[PDB]
Amino acid sequence: TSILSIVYKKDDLIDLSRYGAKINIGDRVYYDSIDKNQIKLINLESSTIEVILKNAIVYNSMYENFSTSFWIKIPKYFSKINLNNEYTIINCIENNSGWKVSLNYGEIIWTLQDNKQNIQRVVFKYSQMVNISDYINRWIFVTITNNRLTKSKIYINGRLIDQKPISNLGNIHASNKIMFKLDGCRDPRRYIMIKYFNLFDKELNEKEIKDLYDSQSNSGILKDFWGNYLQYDKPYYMLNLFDPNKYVDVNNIGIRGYMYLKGPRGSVVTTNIYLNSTLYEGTKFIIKKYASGNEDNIVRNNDRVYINVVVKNKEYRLATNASQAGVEKILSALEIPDVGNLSQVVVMKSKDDQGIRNKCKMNLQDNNGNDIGFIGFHLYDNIAKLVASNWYNRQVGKASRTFGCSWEFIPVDDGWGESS
């Protein structure tokens, strides 16, 4: 069902479909070191990704249905330069006819054109004045379904936001070449990241789209805040999803000492552009290998690892005393060589028992492989104390809503721009 599918291979970009589409890459197109499949495009002419299709797969029919799917990561807009600056990233238009993808300030634009110069547009808008966003500088699964008979729809993360009729359009003659390049942006430091771009010759339903979403999500590998791979020996700022206005903090070091959720968070402000909440507050959480047989530094599901807490630019260890009062066990930061037999091995969870993808959960375990409980927080005398309790496992078994078992890992990113 796939006609074009850009994937990575041995120092080249190829097409998985049985068409062998010619791909030309510019001399300044960059790739990541760990997830080299995803590609980055910068605001230069030489940042060129050129793909050429065959004459037998050119969109030149009159009721031909088609769809596209991709992932996009678009950074924060910092100043007033970026306002009202619709710039195209994906162009498939020849002789002023075809389909294109453009972006504005906090918008994703789907535009398709005919030979009669008719314009139909579908828009997703996301705010940038929010405290903590699920779209700013974070990977978004965007797919578009085009039904030439009824209408076209926009889908993000498998959910619908907007749809507009396209019945007025008569005939679309897309270009034989698809253009991936930032075009019409006045900001010299503006870039996007896309990955997993696929083409279809039929309007995908919600079932197929969700199937593709989870298939491409790599549920077997943990994802940090930005949606990238979570990595060993990398400092991560910690955000608790259920109470996202407090940051992990310390007061003392030892068994007596404890770690808690202190707040509220600060703010980074550029007036009338963004009023986000500071994400570089608190203590970093470095993750170290314990029994991972994999050679890479990527953290996968069911990996027993260690947790290193950076306090005053000094590394410590996450441990608890299993034998204590109550069901929840208070987390504490201990010296690495003075941990003794305290429970420190943690199991990192990516998906549920049924295999449903969810956020990051830390499952503290003892040396006997006994589940103390998922790492969370419990209030002691108006103090939010980090605890590990079986209660979260109980709600999981009862298919209830857990409260405090979900965490996000926030590394320092250039796309966020916050001063640390």
Partner 1 sequence: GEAQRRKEREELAQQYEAILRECGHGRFQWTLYFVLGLALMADGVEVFVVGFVLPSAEKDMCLSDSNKGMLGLIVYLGMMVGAFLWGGLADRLGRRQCLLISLSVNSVFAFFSSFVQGYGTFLFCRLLSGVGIGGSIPIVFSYFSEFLAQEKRGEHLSWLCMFWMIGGVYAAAMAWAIIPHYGWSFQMGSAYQFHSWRVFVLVCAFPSVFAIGALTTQPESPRFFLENGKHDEAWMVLKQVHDTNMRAKGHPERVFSVTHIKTIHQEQRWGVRALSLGGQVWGNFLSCFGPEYRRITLMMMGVWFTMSFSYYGLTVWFPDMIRHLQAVDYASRTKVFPGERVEHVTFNFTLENQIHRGGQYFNDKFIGLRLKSVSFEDSLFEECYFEDVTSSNTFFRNCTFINTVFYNTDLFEYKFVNSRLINSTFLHNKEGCPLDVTGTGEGAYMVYFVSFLGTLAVLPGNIVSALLMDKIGRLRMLAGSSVMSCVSCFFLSFGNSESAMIALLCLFGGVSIASWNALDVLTVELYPSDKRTTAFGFLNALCKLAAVLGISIFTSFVGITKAAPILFASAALALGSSLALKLPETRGQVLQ
Ligand X SMILES: *[C@@H]1O[C@H](CO[C@@H]2O[C@@H](C)[C@@H](O)[C@@H](O)[C@@H]2O)[C@@H](O[C@@H]2O[C@H](CO)[C@@H](O)[C@H](O)[C@H]2NC(C)=O)[C@H](O)[C@H]1NC(C)=O
Binding-site ranges for ligand X (CB under 6 A): 75, 78-79, 189, 417, 419
Q: Give φ, ψ of 212 to 5 degrees.
A: -65, -40
Smallest gap from residue 345 Cβ to ligand X (A): 37
CA atoms of 104 and 123, how far apart (whole Å): 10
Residue 274 burial by Cβ neighbours in a 10 Å radius (0-12, 13-18, 19+): buried
- Give the nearer residue to partner 1 in terms of CB position, either 353 or 414: 414
Binding partner of residue 249 among partner 1, ligand X, none, CB cut-off 5 to 8 Å per kind: none
Binding partner of residue 302 among ligand X, partner 1, none, CB cut-off 5 to 8 Å per kind: none
Binding partner of residue 189 among ligand X, partner 1, none, CB cut-off 5 to 8 Å per kind: ligand X
- Give the nearer residue to partner 1 in terms of CB position, either 224 or 281: 281
Binding partner of residue 267 among ligand X, partner 1, none, CB cut-off 5 to 8 Å per kind: partner 1
Smallest gap from residue 76 Cβ to ligand X (A): 7
Binding partner of residue 382 among ligand X, partner 1, none, CB cut-off 5 to 8 Å per kind: partner 1
- Give the nearer residue to partner 1 in terms of CB position, either 203 or 413: 413
- Give the nearer residue to partner 1 in terms of CB position, either 95 or 419: 419
User: Which SS3 state, helix, strand or coil, does residue 310 take?
Assistant: strand
Report the run of H or E that residue 123 belongs to, with start and end. strand 119-125
Tell me which residues touch partner 1 (CB under 8 A).
78-79, 266-271, 278, 281, 382, 417-419
Smallest gap from residue 362 Cβ to ligand X (A): 30
Q: Which two tokens stand for residue 380?
A: 């002691």
- One-letter amino acid identity for 414? D
Whether the bond between 264 and the residue before it is cis, its omega within 30 degrees of 0, is yes
Report the run of H or E that residue 112 belongs to, with start and end. strand 107-113
- Give the nearer residue to partner 1 in terms of CB position, either 79 or 370: 79
Smallest gap from residue 335 Cβ to partner 1 (A): 28
CA atoms of 193 and 274, how far apart (whole Å): 21
- Give the nearer residue to partner 1 in terms of CB position, either 99 or 280: 280
CA atoms of 238 and 258, how far apart (whole Å): 16
**Dihedral of the alpha carbons of 81, 112, 73, 299, in degrees to the nearest 10:** 180
Smallest gap from residue 372 Cβ to ligand X (A): 41
Binding partner of residue 75 among partner 1, ligand X, none, CB cut-off 5 to 8 Å per kind: ligand X
Sign of CA dihedral 309, 314, 319, 325: negative
Binding partner of residue 9 among partner 1, ligand X, none, CB cut-off 5 to 8 Å per kind: none
Cβ-Cβ contacts under 8 Å for 272 (sequence gap 6 or more): 80
Chain residue at closest Cβ approach to ligand X: 417
Smallest gap from residue 74 Cβ to partner 1 (A): 19
Q: Which two tokens stand for residue 356?
A: 């449903």
Diameter over CA atoms, the chain: 76
The Cβ-side half-sphere exposure at 334, using a 13 Å CA radius, reads 19
Question: Which is nearest to 408 in space by CA: 360, 371, 347?
Answer: 360
CA atoms of 86 and 90, how far apart (whole Å): 12
Binding partner of residue 268 among ligand X, partner 1, none, CB cut-off 5 to 8 Å per kind: partner 1
CA atoms of 232 and 286, how far apart (whole Å): 7
CA atoms of 59 and 101, how far apart (whole Å): 16
- Give the nearer residue to ligand X in terms of CB position, either 189 or 394: 189
- Give the nearer residue to ligand X in terms of CB position, either 34 or 269: 269
Smallest gap from residue 280 Cβ to ligand X (A): 11
Smallest gap from residue 182 Cβ to ligand X (A): 12
- Give the nearer residue to partner 1 in terms of CB position, either 271 or 354: 271
Q: Are 412 and 350 in contact (CB under 8 A)?
A: no
Smallest gap from residue 414 Cβ to ligand X (A): 7
